[PDB]
Design a protein around this ligand. Structure first.
Ligand SMILES: [Fe+3]
Ligand SMILES: [Fe+3]
Lengths: 100, 483, 222, 214, 335, 343
């Protein structure tokens, strides 16, 4: 088997340093927070997400595996990807949607 | 038109006149029935087939022609006619070669000395050096001065060090994984058990563009030639269908060949992990039935078509064009947590509606309330039925735990709004609460979600304009089709 | 229809920084041909008599952009570029423009390093814009209840080929051309020296600030 | 890592049609720049390192959402292809199987020149123009591609290409790309190269036709 | 499966099916009834259908020369005007004859048994007339439709001996254009060269390999298009003719289907009885819900005329124990 | 009738042109055998391709404020029942399934709390209150919230070892067809320094030939089509092997001979042949009748087609011949799928 984030090419910089967060400008990124629910989404655009707290379980459509992202992971969701994001406990992130 | 349909059968329907080896009674049938229902047979060939119906006559024919009867049993399998024009295959100059380490070294998850690996990897820049046939012969080292000790192969020797260390650490794991995943041996599979020889080249040793001497070990009509190139996997030259009708004359089993590795695939996903091309018996002018994609396995662990395609590079499953345009749709404001907030809201209100039977709640705080006995946390939802006016509907039952509820502050609002409702009675009016703190919170979550949908749409508009200017695809290329 | 407005300076005025040969080709050949082919396209068509900004927005067609669009957008972009620079430009802005730069980038030096990065990484041909982002979508749920001052940011956005922020209902403020013809005669491959020279010695911050005032006027009209 | 592969010819060899300065800047600083950027990117992803050049291009195209590494790898390949697509003494007319294929797929070499000139004139912004062999349709086509995009992303086999980035002609021709295109077609294009590319394509796209027995 | 079935079970399972669905099925087709002035409305609330057991036992009904029957009641809405002019009385709809367990109905004192009928199965069939390839739809109402080719295709649909129309013209009358024909047939340039009940739906889907959903119980135009395409198949020989006489092409109507048909007739008579009594109520005023605007006559006399007269309802051959069984397993082509 | 599922083959003696255009019926001008090659019929035609190996098969507040317990969403709403305490009365079709322009309530006070954002809904409500939209159906069902033994009810209304695939591009490219090949179909008929196989190394771009990956050989057609005039002097009828080291020094241990360097062992060895232009009893694609034999040995060949040839055995795809006579008509194009019992 190959890791799920490698097949979908979901880049994940885990435990990001401030030297990268201030380059990306994460302090200016929009906030989103979610508690405990399922969000089905299709990424029409690449999204760059810094998880400020909590955890997310992402299951690509039809998949039975998941990929897990934790606070301090910086995730690049690629466009055209369709996934169901599951949040089991209070969750907060900052995001920027990035066009070509 | 007969010949046009013959061509259409060859090219499209995959026809070929594969010669049929017939028992002498079936041949006698396939000849005599050309002449009539019960006619006295006239054709010399049909009379000959009628005579051949006795094996004693076949014996006599053997003795008269002198061919030994096993040689005749062999000769009956001879190709019926029209043998193709011999191959005239000519080398495009000398085969000039470098021992360059594979680029996909080390294998995934194997750790090596990165300074040795950088030394290995410096060899790959050598591929940019020109070589001219007007320049090879003037400096050519030959004989004693071309003994191996004269050659600078040090980056390759370091590669060989790391390779042998990897083989020593992994040959057993890879044999176990072969027996685990592959039930039966087949040419593309890892040679294993009593057939493995110590010193077979492992798959990391090969790379596209490497040239190999090998032996053609098997032909499969629907897959192509398989070649021992010294590895634990046979290399695969893709040849399919009626192309073999000619190639069967040139590419026999047991031939020695020179082949070029053209792709190297993952042996777990892909059925044949080394694709090859025949270099010396160059047959490129007779391979018409190309494979669109390299064959794969669909395995016990596979469970999602999309995940297998992107594990092997196949195009996605088509869908009907939705006819909506992505950027013209609405913005999803409705945050999915708000439904759960709504449950929590009404749960708080339910609790407060029981706290305003106050005698039941004496002696404890609201934040001190527990769940009841038997509180099954392991399912949020029950299902059942409900009735009104002699008819039935489904009922969904949503459990909420008292640990989830902001009961103290909800009580603070409850008491505050009760006091205001009494002042409203002193105003002489009703008291519409416009929102509670839960409705405000739900609106905040909706605002966060709408903000995402806005920033997504705006980035989508920029993306669209960029891709339209640059001719890049807007929707995923394979995802949609009209039919 | 339209006419090739000369740049608002003498063609010698940039000489140490953008040569008269560069100006002669970039205005007198490239921009000239954009505006003349635009004129040839719009004459006898429902696009004629419209404003250039409106010919751009219409011919963009919401993607599937019409053949006029490349010329219309290039003519507008180049007019905006020529007004975007001056002899004796560069330095640092003032007033509302500096206040917004300090709000949305934290300082003017972060802005200048981020406009320089954007420009130096606009792969291929195209443009890099500073824009005032008070856009409105037509989605039908686009409108925001409870609007806030921070929304209506300055943004650095880079666009390929002819694309410009008008097509998103942004208001451009500053543009650097990053087509090779903008710099190849003066800097050859050294795009980074061209961008440095542009920010240091050419930018008409007065004009950027006037454009910002106009963008305020447009946004507050809403 | 990839080396900076030279042009086959000396950098002065395309004079007067492509000046020594034009080639020195275009190869020695643009193409060099793409090579160095690509090597700096491949130094920190072993997966992208392990791909062949065509695999690397196709993987970094990412089915139309190109990875950061795509533009460098694609430009390195495109320029490697461009230098061999030119030569000193690049004649007016192809010969043998290239001319046969052009005349069967375009009807005439004049139609080919018209299609190539129109593709290179109508390509907007930076870009490339390719004579390619289509893989499923066993036929030649002319395709223009913007920025770094190249036919390998579609698994088409390129046969000839013209760089249509301004850095390739602006020093010698400034705004009049049409004269650069005409000079390329008349004096630079290497049909001997087109022949060797067709010969390699034949290993993967058999563009003869079978012999069917009776 | 494991054992010889009960011989009367074919009757038993038929009658239970008639009770288990045929009552709902036939009562559901009872319409709302409207008066001549479009102001008063009557309907049966089929959901209230209630068979009360026979108040007379079998051995009393046979002795008294009566029918052993259960009584069907249904509640009936009647809006005599707007608002509260409504009654919703439970009304007696009438006697349905009940089967006794060995498979017979006591009717006016005499044991009767409903002989099974064999019919041509619904579906589509191809006959080689004299070659004249001739398609024929059979609907479960017994309605034919014919399609024909004699030479050079030019397929005609045939309605009468003086009425034939080309199938593209019929499809145009059914609102399908030449573009739909071109899209939905295998040999569209042949077509362009010319310029049912649940059982029926099943059998046409099976015989044409079509996949129209079962809910399209009626004939679709695409069914006729597929029939013409298969007829072109037959013309080329890409198919087979069908032998109508073979037992494979027959269906059996049991006591269930005949009793259900007779309930259909009885309710259509009830419709005429309600319309005529609503007339008398809208011209003579009279009294609301005297029981209701319903008489017992339609059902009772429909079923009793079925048993008295229908060729497939025959006195039980009580000669010996064998004939009592064999009679209820006859299969008649008449009727 | 086809006694098994499989595909039709006719080597010869059957006309390749249908009897009448747009038919699959082919005339027999002479006797022949129609072979049915066995195969299991059945698909995500994106992911299944040829030769893929399938191993898987009541408070006073809420009298005026129960609109704070209600909710409205993208195509949903919830209204409390206590009939709502707000005094608006709700009614539902007996089956719970509404239709266009259906009454859902009869009786303005807000039914739902005013959310700041209201995404474009397909459900519309309009004033008694009626529900409408735009095969989609809107249905009611009950939601109960249960906490610490307290219950509250809301109506929710909303708008609702196995085989190898071998596969055919067909009469049109969407109508692709499959045979599963398997042990049910294909069977093996029983058995009937030093050089070694190995890499030679990586071949370099010989820049007299303008290709990144070198063309190493021309076949007889490619020398006519694609051999440049100036390259004729380098077209060799024998392999010449050269090695270039990491310092660009070029080696050839004997240029008159075919010596080459095996990378693993770094010693010169002779190729097996000069590789200039200079066998098994039975050949790929041949068909056998039952009880043919290659030799007096007891394994008579079964009827079928040779799929696989190996050094000492072959694998035969089982096929059955049907003898047919002149003027017999054959119901199929070549390679048609015949199912069991098809004419
Ligand atoms: Fe410009
Ligand atoms: Fe270039």
């Amino acid at each position: 088997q190959t890791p799920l984030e490698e097949l979908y090419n979901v880049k994940v910089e885990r435990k990001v340093s401030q030297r990268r967060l201030d380059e990306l400008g994460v302090s200016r990124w929009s906030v989103w927070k979610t508690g405990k629910c399922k969000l089905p989404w299709d990424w029409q655009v690449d999204q760059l997400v810094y998880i400020e707290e909590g955890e997310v379980r992402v299951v690509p459509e039809g998949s039975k595996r998941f990929m897990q992202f934790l606070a301090g992971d910086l995730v690049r969701y690629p466009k055209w990807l369709e996934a169901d994001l599951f949040f089991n406990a209070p969750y907060s992130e900052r995001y920027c949607f990035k066009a070509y | 038109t007969e010949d046009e349909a013959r061509r259409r059968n060859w090219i499209e329907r995959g026809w070929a006149p594969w010669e049929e080896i017939l028992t002498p009674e079936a041949d006698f049938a396939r000849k005599s029935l050309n002449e009539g229902e019960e006619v006295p047979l006239q054709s010399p060939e049909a009379i000959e087939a009628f005579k051949m119906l006795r094996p004693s006559y076949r014996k006599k024919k053997i003795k008269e022609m002198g061919i030994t009867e096993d040689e005749w049993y062999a000769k009956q399998f001879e190709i019926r006619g029209d043998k193709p024009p011999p191959l005239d295959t000519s080398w495009a100059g000398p085969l000039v070669v470098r021992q360059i380490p594979p680029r996909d070294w080390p294998p995934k998850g194997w750790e090596v000395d990165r300074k040795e690996l950088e030394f290995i990897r410096e060899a790959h820049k050598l591929m940019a050096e020109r070589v001219w046939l007007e320049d090879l012969d003037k400096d050519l080292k030959v004989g004693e001065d071309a003994t191996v000790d004269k050659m600078c192969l040090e980056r390759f020797k370091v590669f060989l060090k790391q390779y042998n260390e990897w083989v020593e650490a992994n040959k057993d794991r890879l044999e176990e994984d072969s027996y685990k995943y592959d039930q039966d041996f087949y040419p593309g599979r890892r040679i294993r058990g009593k057939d493995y020889k110590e010193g077979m080249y492992e798959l990391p040793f090969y790379y596209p563009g490497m040239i190999c001497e090998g032996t053609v070990t098997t032909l499969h009509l629907y897959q192509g030639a398989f070649v021992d190139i010294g590895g634990v996997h046979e290399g695969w030259v893709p040849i399919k269908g009626n192309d073999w009708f000619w190639i069967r004359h040139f590419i026999r089993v047991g031939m020695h060949v020179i082949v070029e590795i053209t792709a190297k695939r993952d042996p777990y996903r892909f059925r044949f992990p080394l694709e090859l091309r025949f270099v010396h018996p160059n047959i490129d002018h007779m391979i018409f039935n190309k494979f669109d994609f390299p064959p794969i396995f669909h395995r016990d662990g596979d469970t999602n078509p999309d995940e297998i395609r992107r594990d092997c590079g196949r195009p996605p499953e088509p869908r009907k064009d939705p006819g909506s345009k992505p950027e013209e749709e609405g913005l999803l404001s409705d945050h999915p947590y708000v439904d759960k907030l709504w449950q929590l809201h009404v749960a708080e209100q339910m609790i407060l509606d029981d706290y305003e039977n106050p005698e039941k709640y004496k002696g404890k705080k609201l934040s001190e309330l527990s769940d009841d006995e038997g509180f099954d946390e392991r399912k949020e939802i029950e299902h059942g039925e409900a009735y009104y006016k002699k008819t039935k509907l489904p009922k969904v039952i949503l459990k909420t735990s008292v640990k989830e509820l902001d009961l103290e502050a909800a009580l603070i609002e409850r008491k505050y709004h009760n006091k205001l409702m009494m002042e409203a009675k002193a105003r002489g009016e009703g008291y519409k609460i416009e929102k509670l703190r839960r409705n405000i919170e739900m609106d905040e979550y909706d605002s966060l979600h709408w903000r995402r949908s806005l920033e997504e749409r705006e980035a989508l508009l920029r993306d669209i304009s960029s891709r339209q200017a640059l001719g890049l695809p807007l929707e995923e290329p394979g995802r949609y089709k009209p039919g | 229809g339209f006419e090739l407005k000369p740049p608002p300076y003498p063609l010698d005025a940039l000489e140490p920084h953008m040569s008269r040969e560069t100006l002669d080709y970039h205005w007198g050949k490239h921009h000239k041909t954009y505006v003349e082919n635009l004129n040839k396209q719009i004459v006898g068509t429902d696009l004629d008599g419209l404003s250039l900004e409106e010919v751009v927005l219409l011919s963009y067609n919401r993607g599937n952009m019409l053949p006029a669009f490349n010329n219309a957008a290039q003519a507008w972009n180049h007019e905006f570029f020529w007004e975007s620079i001056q002899p004796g430009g560069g330095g640092k802005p003032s007033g509302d423009l500096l206040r917004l730069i300090e709000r949305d980038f934290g300082s003017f030096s972060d802005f200048v390093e981020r406009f320089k990065a954007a420009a130096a990484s606009n792969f291929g041909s195209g443009w890099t814009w500073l824009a005032y982002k008070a856009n409105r979508l037509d989605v039908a749920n686009a409108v925001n209840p409870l609007p806030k001052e921070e929304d209506k940011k300055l943004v650095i956005v880079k666009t390929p080929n002819a694309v410009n922020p008008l097509v998103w209902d942004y208001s451009p403020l500053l543009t650097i051309d990053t087509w090779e013809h903008a710099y190849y005669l003066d800097f050859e491959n050294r795009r980074i020296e061209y961008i440095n020279t542009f920010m240091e010695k050419l930018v008409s911050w007065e004009t950027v600030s006037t454009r910002l005032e106009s963008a305020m006027a447009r946004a507050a009209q809403r | 890592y990839y080396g900076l592969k030279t042009p086959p010819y000396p950098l002065d060899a395309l004079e007067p049609y492509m000046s020594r300065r034009t080639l020195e800047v275009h190869w020695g600083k643009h193409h060099r720049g793409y090579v160095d950027n690509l090597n700096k990117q491949l130094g920190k992803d072993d997966k992208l390192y392990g791909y062949t050049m065509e695999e690397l291009i196709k993987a970094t195209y990412n089915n139309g959402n190109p990875l950061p590494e795509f533009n460098n790898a694609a430009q390195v390949y495109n320029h490697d292809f461009f230098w061999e697509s030119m030569q000193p003494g690049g004649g007016d007319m192809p010969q043998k199987g290239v001319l046969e294929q052009i005349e069967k797929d375009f009807g005439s070499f004049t139609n080919f020149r018209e299609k190539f000139t129109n593709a290179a004139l109508t390509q907007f912004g930076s870009g490339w123009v390719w004579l390619v062999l289509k893989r499923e349709e066993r036929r030649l086509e002319v395709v223009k591609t913007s920025n770094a995009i190249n036919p390998l992303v579609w698994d088409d086999i390129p046969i000839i290409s013209l760089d249509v980035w301004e850095h390739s002609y602006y020093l010698d021709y400034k705004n009049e790309r049409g004269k650069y295109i005409n000079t390329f077609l008349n004096h630079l294009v290497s049909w001997n190269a087109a022949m060797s590319r067709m010969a390699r394509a034949e290993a993967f796209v058999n563009l003869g036709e079978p012999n069917i027995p009776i | 499966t494991s054992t010889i079935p009960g011989f009367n079970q074919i009757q038993f399972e038929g009658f239970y099916r008639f009770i288990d669905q045929g009552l709902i099925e036939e009562l559901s087709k009872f319409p709302k009834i409207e008066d001549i002035d479009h102001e008063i409305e009557f309907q049966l609330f089929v959901e209230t259908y209630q068979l009360v057991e026979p108040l007379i036992k079998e051995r009393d009904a046979v002795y008294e020369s009566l029918t052993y029957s259960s009584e069907l009641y249904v509640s009936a809405g009647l809006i005599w005007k707007t608002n509260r002019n409504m009654q919703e009385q439970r009304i007696f709809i009438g006697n349905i004859p009940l089967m006794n367990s060995l498979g017979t109905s006591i009717v006016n004192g005499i044991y009767r048994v409903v002989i099974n009928q064999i019919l041509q199965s619904p579906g589509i069939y191809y006959q080689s007339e004299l070659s004249v390839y001739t398609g024929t739809i059979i609907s479960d109402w017994g309605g034919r439709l014919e399609l024909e080719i004699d030479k050079k295709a030019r397929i005609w649909a045939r309605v009468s001996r003086k009425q034939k129309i080309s199938i593209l013209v019929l499809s145009s009358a059914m609102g399908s254009n030449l573009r739909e024909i071109l899209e939905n047939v295998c040999y569209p340039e042949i077509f362009l060269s010319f310029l049912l009940g649940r059982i029926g739906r099943r059998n046409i889907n099976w015989r044409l390999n079509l996949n129209i959903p079962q809910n399209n119980i009626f004939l679709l135009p695409r069914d006729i298009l597929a029939a013409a395409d298969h007829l072109i198949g037959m013309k080329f020989g890409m198919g087979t003719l069908d032998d109508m006489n073979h037992l494979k092409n027959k269906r059996i109507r049991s006591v269930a289907d005949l009793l259900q048909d007779q309930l259909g007739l009885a309710l259509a008579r009830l419709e005429n009885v309600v319309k005529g009594t609503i007339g008398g109520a809208i011209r003579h005023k009279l009294i609301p819900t005297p029981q209701n605007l319903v008489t017992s006559t339609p059902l009772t006399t429909t079923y009793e005329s079925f048993f008295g007269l229908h060729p497939l309802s025959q006195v039980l051959d009580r000669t010996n124990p064998l004939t009592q069984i064999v009679h209820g397993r006859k299969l008649s082509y008449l009727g | 009738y086809s006694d098994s599922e499989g595909e039709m083959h006719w080597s010869t003696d059957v006309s390749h042109a249908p009897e009448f255009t747009y038919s699959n019926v082919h005339l027999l001008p002479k006797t022949s055998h129609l072979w049915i090659l066995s195969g299991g019929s059945c698909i995500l035609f994106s992911i299944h391709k040829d030769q893929d190996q399938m191993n898987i098969p009541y408070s006073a507040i809420f009298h005026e404020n129960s609109d704070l317990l209600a909710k409205r969403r993208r195509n949903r709403f919830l209204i409390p029942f206590q009939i709502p305490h707000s005094g608006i009365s709700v009614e539902i079709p007996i089956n719970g399934i509404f239709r266009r322009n259906s009454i859902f309530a009869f009786f303005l006070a807000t039914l739902f709390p005013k959310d700041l954002f209201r995404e474009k809904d397909n459900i519309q409500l309009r004033v008694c209150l009626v529900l409408n939209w735009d095969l989609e159906e809107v249905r009611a069902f009950f939601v109960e919230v249960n906490t610490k033994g307290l219950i509250r009810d809301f109506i929710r209304i909303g708008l609702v070892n196995h085989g190898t695939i071998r596969m055919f591009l067909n009469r049109n490219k969407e109508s692709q067809s499959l045979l599963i090949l398997s042990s049910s179909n294909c069977f093996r008929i029983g058995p009937f320094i030093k050089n070694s196989s190995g890499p030679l190394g990586t071949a370099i771009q010989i820049s007299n030939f303008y290709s990144f990956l070198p063309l190493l050989t021309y076949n007889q057609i490619s020398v006519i089509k694609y051999l440049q005039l100036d390259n004729f002097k380098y077209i060799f009828q024998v392999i010449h092997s050269y090695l270039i080291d990491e310092n660009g020094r070029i080696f050839n241990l004997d240029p008159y001979s075919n010596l080459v360097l095996n990378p693993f062992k770094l010693n010169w060895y002779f190729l097996h042949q000069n590789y200039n232009n200079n066998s098994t009893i039975i050949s790929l694609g041949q068909f056998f009748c039952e009880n043919v034999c290659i030799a007096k040995k007891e394994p008579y060949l079964k009827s079928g087609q040779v799929l696989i040839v190996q050094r000492d055995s072959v694998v035969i795809r089982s096929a059955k011949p049907y003898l047919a006579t002149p003027g017999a008509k054959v119901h199929g194009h070549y390679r048609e799928i015949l199912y069991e019992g098809d004419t």
